[PDB]
């Protein structure tokens, strides 16, 4: 219906709107994660900083998707944003496990959208995702995996010590 | 219950959580406003820019409230974020009228929270709002009022012309 | 037949030659558009400048295709270049409508070539188009759509006024 | 009685003198805390530095109150300064617990003085405290709470190790 729209299916348009919702939900989750680690009874500033930076990145990803939706002549449609899955996030290990589950869900949504684009013979969409999302997700997931491994080696028989040291010597 | 909490009522803690929700909702609204004016069939870049900057400011306000909630020993609780009130925002005049209604609602929430703080004899809260929110809101509302007046004078018998000129000569 | 040629079909080679012709034709069209707006009885310097810059870009696109044809071991074959579809281009609105029709035809040719490359399992070709042509076309088409919307809002009941203002305040 | 005094009650004047005494007492306490951590058999330089900086800050707060007392036309009256509550301060955990108790007592005195000012309709006093004391106290108390949480997580089954690491990696 737009004057500019060309080779942009309704199915891809809708799936992009849904992916915007998922990225904004993920940003909201990271916001909650960050402020949890800033509580005086949690107090891990490098962990807070790690998650607040991811909140920014996910919002930015949403904004990139929205810009692309308008460049293609689709129409942004916003839905309610559900609250994060928890109010309290446990230990740094617990939080990093929730983070990697969240990133793998975003990655799967990206892969699903790429498959849809491929089925709809939409190369601009496929290039867009390849260029700005797929590698960024793989790199982040790798980094979170590396963090989980280091967190876990640090538990030992002194879990508090290990949590402090990881925050001080990796994250800060 | 926190080790740090002192003179911070449950009523203020809850009202701060609700105000965070209102600011994040307002940011979401501004996000939608901005991307609407970036549509190829709307195409008012200075209007898009105006609203995207307000989306940033409202998110920042939420983050300031959350930081203060943790400094006082309260506990951030996030709720679902409702979607904006419209999907399409009309003319620049329509959008600026919706914006001033939104800002007056935030201002009222701030005034209500200040009244609660006063009733609870919570001077740190009152100072916080005075210092970082109340003047910012008055200044913004004044600016939006000035814009509405200029938009309206520009309608005349050539509404398209006036909309272009306001975007070009005030907003851009 | 070249010593270097590998995985480069005859069908893709021919289609690249045809796309070079289309890009050079488009450059020629933009040349004519630009010099039309430089006529003393048309006299819209920002419109002339807009189209002369597109003439350059389209020639550059042709040259990129030719460089790629030789990198793959294909052989450039040039055909006659037909003259542009008009001698006189009307108003800025008329000209911008002809421009977006032209860009959508180039975009379709790019999409058709990408589909051919996909059918011929030629990933270097697909990457080439994705990297240097497909996004450039979407961005240009979006920009032209934005311009058409602004031009149209400016017609009103004073078409000459609107044409001057768009040239002065958007294009120049 | 001063030529300048206006809207400055006797009750506020006396309460300001008492608050000067409390701030100077707090500085003295921090002096003792700092020199304790500089003992050769305690030897935690980052802890010493933390407390010596607080000794400076509390003296500065006293001096600000005295300057304000003279700006309002009140009259500074000094009393004996009692010695700190302990001669030896234990572990870093013990010392940080004593510090937060001390800061909460200063904060309460500030809140009490603000309430008195409010009852006496003395807005200059209320502004003074809001501007230079109330937020500074909340921020400090938050920081001490964060430190206590980190100190406690570090005790584990190796209290000496944890005390060294906190001094090295947070305080120094
Ligand atoms: Cl479709
Ligand atoms: Cl920070
Ligand atoms: Cl939910
Ligand atoms: Cl309460
Ligand atoms: Cl922009
Ligand atoms: Cl709703
Ligand atoms: Cl072949
Ligand atoms: Cl020129
Ligand atoms: Cl011809
Ligand atoms: Cl009096
Ligand atoms: Cl030193
Ligand atoms: Cl004593
Ligand atoms: Pt940070
Ligand atoms: Pt960082
Ligand atoms: Pt693909
Ligand atoms: Pt890109
Ligand atoms: Pt990117
Ligand atoms: Pt902008
Ligand atoms: Pt700006
Ligand atoms: Pt107040
Ligand atoms: Pt402040
Ligand atoms: Pt501020
Ligand atoms: Pt020029
Ligand atoms: Pt130029
Ligand atoms: Pt492809
Ligand atoms: Pt390239
Ligand atoms: Pt390129
Ligand atoms: Pt020092
Ligand atoms: Pt220092
Ligand atoms: Pt007050
Ligand atoms: Pt001051
Ligand atoms: Pt100050």
* Phi, psi for residue C170 in degrees, rounded to 5: -110, -50
Q: Cβ–Cβ of C153/B160 closer than 8 Å?
A: yes
Q: Cβ–Cβ of D100/B3 closer than 8 Å?
A: yes
Chain C hits for B158, Cβ within 8 Å: 156-158
Cα separation, C156 vs C146, whole angstroms = 17
Contacts for A56 with CB less than 8 Å, ≥ 6 apart: A27
Residue keyed to tokens 């608050």: D19
Cα separation, B167 vs B10, whole angstroms = 46
In the structure, ligand 27 is a single-atom ion and the residues with CB under 5 Å from it are: C 132
| Interface test with chain B among D117, D132, D141, D152, by most B beta carbons within 10 Å | D141
Cα separation, D125 vs C80, whole angstroms = 88
Cα separation, C101 vs C97, whole angstroms = 6
* Contact between B37 and B95 (Cβ < 8 Å): yes
Cα separation, B6 vs B4, whole angstroms = 6
Residue-wise DSSP of D44-82: -HHHHHHHHHHHHHHHHHHHHHHHHHHHHT--------P
Cα separation, D8 vs D74, whole angstroms = 8
Q: Is A13 annotated for ligand binding?
A: no
Domains of chain B (ranges, CATH numbers): 1-172 (1.20.1260.10)
Interface list for chain D against chain B, based on CB atoms closer than 8 Å = 100, 104, 107-108, 111, 114-115, 118, 126, 129-131, 134-135, 138-139, 141-142, 144-145, 148
Contacts for A8 with CB less than 8 Å, ≥ 6 apart: A72, A73, A74, A122, A125
In B, minimum Cα distance to D135 occurs at B124
Chain C hits for A124, Cβ within 8 Å: 130, 134-135, 138
Distance separating the N- and C-terminal Cα atoms of chain D: 50
Feature table: binding site of D for Fe cation? 53, 56-57, 60, 63
C-D interface (Cβ pairs under 8 Å ≥ 3): no
Burial bucket for residue A163 (CB in 10 Å: 0-12, 13-18, 19+): buried
* Contact between C55 and C30 (Cβ < 8 Å): yes
Q: Cβ–Cβ of A3/C145 closer than 8 Å?
A: yes
Q: Is the dihedral of CA C98, C103, C107, C112 positive or negative?
A: positive
Interface list for chain B against chain C, based on CB atoms closer than 8 Å = 40-43, 45, 157-158, 160-161, 163-165, 168-169
Q: Of B4, B41, B83, which has the smallest distance from its Cβ to A2's Cβ?
A: B41
Report residue C33 as tokens: 């558009």
Burial bucket for residue C67 (CB in 10 Å: 0-12, 13-18, 19+): exposed
* Contact between B150 and B168 (Cβ < 8 Å): no
Q: Phi-psi bin for A74: left (phi > 0), alpha (psi -120 to 50), beta? A: beta
Q: Cβ–Cβ of C111/A123 closer than 8 Å?
A: yes
Cα separation, A122 vs A139, whole angstroms = 25
Burial bucket for residue B48 (CB in 10 Å: 0-12, 13-18, 19+): buried
Cα separation, B66 vs B23, whole angstroms = 11
Burial bucket for residue C28 (CB in 10 Å: 0-12, 13-18, 19+): middle
Resolution, Å (one decimal): 1.3
Cα separation, C39 vs C62, whole angstroms = 28
Distance (angstroms) between ligand 9 centre and the Cα of C82 equals 4
Q: Of A157, A164, A169, which has the smallest distance from its Cβ to D153's Cβ?
A: A164
């Amino acid at each position: 219906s737009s004057q500019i729209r060309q080779n942009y299916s309704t199915e891809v348009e809708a799936a992009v709107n849904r992916l915007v919702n998922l990225y904004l939900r993920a940003s909201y989750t990271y916001l909650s994660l960050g402020f949890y680690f800033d509580r005086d009874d949690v107090a891990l500033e490098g962990v807070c900083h790690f998650f607040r930076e991811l909140a920014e990145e996910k919002r930015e990803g949403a904004e990139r998707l929205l810009k692309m939706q308008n460049q293609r002549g689709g129409r942004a449609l916003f839905q309610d944003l559900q609250k994060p899955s928890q109010d309290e996030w446990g230990t740094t290990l617990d939080a990093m496990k929730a983070a990697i589950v969240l990133e793998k869900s975003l990655n799967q949504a990206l892969l699903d959208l790429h498959a849809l684009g491929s089925a709809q013979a939409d190369p601009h969409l496929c290039d867009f995702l390849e260029s700005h999302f797929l590698d960024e997700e793989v790199k982040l997931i790798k980094k979170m995996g590396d963090h989980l491994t280091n967190i876990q080696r640090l538990v030992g028989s002194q879990a508090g010590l290990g949590e402090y040291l990881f925050e001080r010597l990796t994250l800060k």
